[PDB]
Design a protein around this ligand. Structure first.
Ligand SMILES: Cc1ncc(-c2ccnc(Nc3ccc(N4CCN(C(=O)CO)CC4)cc3)n2)n1C(C)C
Length: 279
């Protein structure tokens, strides 16, 4: 760690704290994550991530493990998607750029999921962008906390959840890019669930076989009727609404995979625009 010079603080979680830093050595500018006070298991899983290289995953350059404390050195990107969404709020992110970002993140996920790696905690704050029009997944949740992008199976207590949880999260993010408003902004676990239920209908055995035997399922849940998607993400076009609805299917088994999503007609005219970024 003597090799790095802190420049500024760019993040905090209960993983750790992240700094923009400069290799004292030889000026790589990097993001430096100082991790949570390290068991053998953590080291090996993290070393597995160092091999998970893809253009749409923030590159893990190095793992420094000396003295019990753990540091992760990443390629630095200049902005997160949240700040870009906030900056773009009056006009909205143009659809071609939303679509490009969505396609790229689905490519990232397809790759991760093909290697049996789940993100688990997708949100605007851990999607990072650069001037070239790339978007990248960061802060792989390698297991106040935001619940807004949590899949319903997690909220209902599924222990052994699947790659579909990331598709759900990404769907919520897609909706948010389009409407410029969080789809399901819950501030507790039951509020989050009930916000989902109010929009998508209270799930039952018809749309989600086995839902009623999930650990935190309660028969006493209020029974809300589903709303139509034309109300939920106007003025998104039919292709986009079709894709979104498949990304938000209650049953993780019916939820569209990253790979199948890339073949959706919504991406027929996909391009790679450059965002105008003010750094
Ligand atoms: C967690 C984590 N692990 C590694 C990274 C990472 C990797 C590569 N590049 C970055 N760059 C960032 C991240 C965040 C920000 N902004 C966050 C929001 N912000 C604030 O001032 C918030 O108050 C401005 C900086 C700028 C560059 N991170 N991160 C990010 C998501 C904080």
């Amino acid at each position: 760690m003597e090799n790095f010079q802190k420049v500024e603080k760019i993040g905090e979680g209960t993983y750790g704290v992240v700094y923009k830093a400069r290799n004292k050595l030889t000026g790589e500018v990097v993001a430096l994550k100082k991790i949570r006070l390290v068991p053998s298991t953590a080291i090996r899983e993290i070393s597995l991530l160092k091999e998970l290289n893809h253009p749409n995953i923030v590159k893990l350059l190095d793992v420094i493990h000396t003295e019990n404390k753990l540091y992760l050195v990443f390629e630095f990107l200049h902005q997160d998607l949240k700040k870009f969404m906030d900056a773009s709020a009056l006009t909205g992110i143009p659809l071609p750029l939303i679509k490009s970002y969505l396609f790229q993140l689905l490519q990232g996920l397809a790759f991760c999921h093909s290697h049996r790696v789940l993100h688990r905690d997708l949100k605007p704050q851990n999607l990072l962008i650069n001037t070239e029009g790339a978007i990248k997944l960061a802060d792989f949740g390698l297991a106040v906390v935001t619940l807004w992008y949590r899949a319903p199976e997690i909220l209902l207590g599924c222990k052994y959840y699947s790659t579909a949880v990331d598709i759900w999260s990404l769907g919520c993010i897609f909706a948010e890019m389009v409407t410029r408003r969080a789809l399901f902004p819950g501030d507790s676990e039951i509020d989050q669930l009930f916000r989902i239920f109010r929009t998508l209908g209270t799930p039952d055995e018809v749309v989600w076989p086995g839902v009623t035997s999930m650990p935190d399922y309660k028969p006493s849940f209020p029974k809300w009727a589903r709303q139509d998607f034309s109300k939920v993400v106007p003025p998104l076009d039919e292709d986009g609404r079709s894709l979104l609805s498949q990304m938000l299917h209650y049953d993780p088994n019916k939820r569209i995979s990253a790979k199948a999503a890339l073949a959706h007609p919504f991406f027929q005219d996909v391009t790679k625009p450059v965002p105008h970024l003010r750094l």
